Write an enzyme that holds these catalytic residues in place. Sequence first.
Site, PDB file in Angstrom:
ATOM      1  N   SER A 258      52.178 111.766  46.894  1.00 22.68           N
ATOM      2  CA  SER A 258      52.277 112.999  47.656  1.00 22.68           C
ATOM      3  C   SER A 258      53.711 113.194  48.141  1.00 22.68           C
ATOM      4  O   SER A 258      54.426 112.231  48.430  1.00 22.68           O
ATOM      5  CB  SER A 258      51.312 112.972  48.848  1.00 22.68           C
ATOM      6  OG  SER A 258      51.510 114.102  49.676  1.00 22.68           O
TER       7      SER A 258
ATOM      8  N   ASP B 232      32.147 108.039  42.208  1.00 22.25           N
ATOM      9  CA  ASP B 232      33.199 107.306  42.908  1.00 22.25           C
ATOM     10  C   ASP B 232      34.432 107.179  42.013  1.00 22.25           C
ATOM     11  O   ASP B 232      34.464 106.329  41.122  1.00 22.25           O
ATOM     12  CB  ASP B 232      32.668 105.937  43.321  1.00 22.25           C
ATOM     13  CG  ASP B 232      33.694 105.103  44.073  1.00 22.25           C
ATOM     14  OD1 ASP B 232      34.746 105.640  44.461  1.00 22.25           O
ATOM     15  OD2 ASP B 232      33.425 103.909  44.293  1.00 22.25           O
TER      16      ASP B 232
HETATM   17  N1  U1H Z   1      35.861 104.162  46.524  1.00 18.88           N
HETATM   18  C1  U1H Z   1      36.030 102.844  45.943  1.00 18.88           C
HETATM   19  C2  U1H Z   1      37.134 102.055  46.647  1.00 18.88           C
HETATM   20  C3  U1H Z   1      36.904 101.446  47.873  1.00 18.88           C
HETATM   21  C4  U1H Z   1      37.925 100.733  48.490  1.00 18.88           C
HETATM   22  C5  U1H Z   1      39.165 100.637  47.877  1.00 18.88           C
HETATM   23  C6  U1H Z   1      40.313  99.860  48.509  1.00 18.88           C
HETATM   24  F1  U1H Z   1      39.991  99.481  49.782  1.00 18.88           F
HETATM   25  F2  U1H Z   1      40.555  98.757  47.740  1.00 18.88           F
HETATM   26  F3  U1H Z   1      41.431 100.643  48.519  1.00 18.88           F
HETATM   27  C7  U1H Z   1      39.389 101.246  46.656  1.00 18.88           C
HETATM   28  C8  U1H Z   1      38.375 101.957  46.043  1.00 18.88           C
HETATM   29  N1  U1H Z   2      33.798 103.141  48.331  1.00 12.12           N
HETATM   30  C1  U1H Z   2      32.570 102.802  47.633  1.00 12.12           C
HETATM   31  C2  U1H Z   2      31.412 102.942  48.612  1.00 12.12           C
HETATM   32  C3  U1H Z   2      30.708 104.133  48.661  1.00 12.12           C
HETATM   33  C4  U1H Z   2      29.660 104.277  49.552  1.00 12.12           C
HETATM   34  C5  U1H Z   2      29.320 103.230  50.385  1.00 12.12           C
HETATM   35  C6  U1H Z   2      28.167 103.404  51.366  1.00 12.12           C
HETATM   36  F1  U1H Z   2      28.236 104.658  51.909  1.00 12.12           F
HETATM   37  F2  U1H Z   2      26.973 103.260  50.721  1.00 12.12           F
HETATM   38  F3  U1H Z   2      28.295 102.463  52.347  1.00 12.12           F
HETATM   39  C7  U1H Z   2      30.026 102.037  50.344  1.00 12.12           C
HETATM   40  C8  U1H Z   2      31.077 101.893  49.452  1.00 12.12           C
END
Ligand code: U1H
Ligand code: U1H
EC number: 3.4.23.22
Length: 330
Positions: free
Chosen positions: A199, A35
Amino acid sequence: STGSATTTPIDSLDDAYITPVQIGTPAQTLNLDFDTGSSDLWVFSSETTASEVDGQTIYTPSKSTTAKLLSGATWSISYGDGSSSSGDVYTDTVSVGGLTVTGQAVESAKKVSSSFTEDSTIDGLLGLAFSTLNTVSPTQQKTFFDNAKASLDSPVFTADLGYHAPGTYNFGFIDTTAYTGSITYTAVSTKQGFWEWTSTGYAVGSGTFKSTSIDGIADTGTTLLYLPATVVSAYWAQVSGAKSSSSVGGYVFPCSATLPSFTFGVGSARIVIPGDYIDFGPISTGSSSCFGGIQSSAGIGINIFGDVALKAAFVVFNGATTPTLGFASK
Ligand SMILES: NCc1ccc(C(F)(F)F)cc1
Ligand SMILES: NCc1ccc(C(F)(F)F)cc1
């Protein structure tokens, strides 16, 4: 040193990608969601509330000879989708595709939200944003990438995600056989702790390219592409019968339609997302309404270049002292 690991979609829609990771001595292999939008390495463990585990592989620190409890440390995280988890912290040896870090913080989940319990294929997350976002208290911890940086041949990792197919995460080197043309690099702001960039515009289908700055984050941990309401309305206006559905929570479209491509700008270069990447299938089994892969960021507060956009490119995360993001066609 370098490392290389295959990443595999968890379902037929590419909702997420899992990558095997070795933890502890002897190795306990768990499949983690890499992630770039978060900075915590947390896993399902023998400490997780038993009712909250449904098929996941668990990390057992008591069976690892290199595991050490980090006395007094706790963690608690909430993701932008309302997901959350929390627990305590071990340090242990962690290896990704041959690349080994000793003394990595491994956050053991004691409590997980329902969305994680229901995802039997994901054993945890491996955060790859900047360590300023790590939630360990009272002593903040470094990410796997930050801990490995010194030993890497080059302070980079690359994401090569597949469309309905396996892909590759590489650490420490750039595979010049995995892309076509040149890599275009663009500046990154770390001020919010994300891989945040700008972008240079977009196009819908074969339409005219619109030069306009779109600030957003490169997030392997988010499935869809979230963009400002003006851009998203311009895209779905080109799809017959598409509409925003409040009950579904986004743009839906008739499953019989053909979707146009979406182009986004990286400096002077263009990344083209094929229309098939934007189809996320019926909203319910048997439905003839399909869910769109481009959605508005209005309710989120930030634009997110999730997997829909990233899997159309070879993406370089350059963690040099001045960090940059590189994009190439493939
Ligand atoms: N993949 C992690 C993640 C999930 C949500 C956000 C948000 F909503 F804060 F932009 C940032 C990073
Ligand atoms: N952005 C972080 C994140 C990644 C995967 C999930 C899931 F798929 F497990 F719900 C939730 C939050």
